[PDB]
Amino acid sequence: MKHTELRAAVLDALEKHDTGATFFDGRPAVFDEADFPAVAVYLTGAEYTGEELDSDTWQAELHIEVFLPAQVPDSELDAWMESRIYPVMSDIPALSDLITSMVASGYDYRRDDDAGLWSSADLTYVITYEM
């Protein structure tokens, strides 16, 4: 619905700064050891919390995952989502017009254990949007 344009707007607002990372839209990914540390944006959930007898007022969940190689220390990830992600999206008017209300949900770490080919930091947001 608006997921395509919401993702486009958020990736554009992410790309305004200096480059140095791939900006994989959506989800299929397929990285290989040449397009490394990168960022992927996608959505989940999207249920029918009504909350008002005026419109559907749906709500979904935003995932932005940044991938760095293998056993790179978590200081690099900390720097990444303190400099490249968290402040840059804090005020984007395009998303403000596209969605109703924005609120942070969580931010965690995961990694490959067997063969350790990757290490991801996930930032998870909650979107209330009128679709």
Partner: protein, 114 residues
């Protein structure tokens, strides 16, 4: 040299296979710095999936180096297979005449020890 009667044979066989099956690895950095070893390198292919589909297909190189010339090799230092740049991750214990050198790719990630 060894109270073996057997490890001598396995060492001779190790030298034979290294000569007949291997590559001239050249090492940079580390205490060894500029040095040359004859190690048989292979690149098995391994893929992880992570999320929905996040295929990160890659390789897990190995060298099968002889222990005597690769002592005190540590882990942080790098390596060069001809024109390609790798970095050792861990060193297998000696099986009697050699050990498997597990290799990474690209610059080693930091040190993060203090």
């Amino acid at each position: 040299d060894f109270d073996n009667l057997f490890d001598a044979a396995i060492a001779r066989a190790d030298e034979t296979i290294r000569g007949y099956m291997g590559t001239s690895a050249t090492i940079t950095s580390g205490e060894q710095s500029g040095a040359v070893i004859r190690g048989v390198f292979d690149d098995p292919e391994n893929i992880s999936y992570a999320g929905q589909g996040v295929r990160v297909e890659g390789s897990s190189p190995s060298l099968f180096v002889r222990t005597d010339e690769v002592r005190q090799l540590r882990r942080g230092d790098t390596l060069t297979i001809g024109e390609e740049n790798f970095w050792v991750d861990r060193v297998s214990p000696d099986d009697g005449g050699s050990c498997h050198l597990w290799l990474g790719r690209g610059v080693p990630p930091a040190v993060n020890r203090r």
